[PDB]
A and B are shown apart, each in its own frame.
With several copies, the nearest count.
Chain A
């Protein structure tokens, strides 16, 4: 939004579990919902390529 994301802003997304609060948050912008897979550096270079 405006401030750099303090890790409290970055949140994981659960899969298979009921997740209506995240689906409500779809329109919202300040929080970040991420997969629990911090991609490796080699994949990072490969994707950049």
Chain B
């Protein structure tokens, strides 16, 4: 047990943003084509 390397933790912290941005774009695009395709 000890404080570990920081580079790999920073890589995971880049991947978390990689997932948040995909979340945002996916949910926004989904609600948008839901509005256009069905709500008309």
Assess A/B contact in the complex (Cβ within 8 A): yes
> From residue A26, how far is it (CB to closest CB) to chain B in Å?
10
Smallest CB-CB separation from B29: which chain A residue? A21
Residues of A within 8 A of B (CB): 20-22, 24-25, 28-31
Q: Name B's interface SS.
A: helix
Q: Name A's interface SS.
A: helix
In whole angstroms, what is the CA distance A22 to B37 when docked? 9
- With an 8 A cutoff between CB atoms, is B40 at the interface? yes
Smallest CB-CB separation from B31: which chain A residue? A21
> From residue B7, how far is it (CB to closest CB) to chain A in Å?
33
Please state if B40 and A21 are interface contacts (CB–CB under 8 Å): no
- With an 8 A cutoff between CB atoms, is B22 at the interface? no
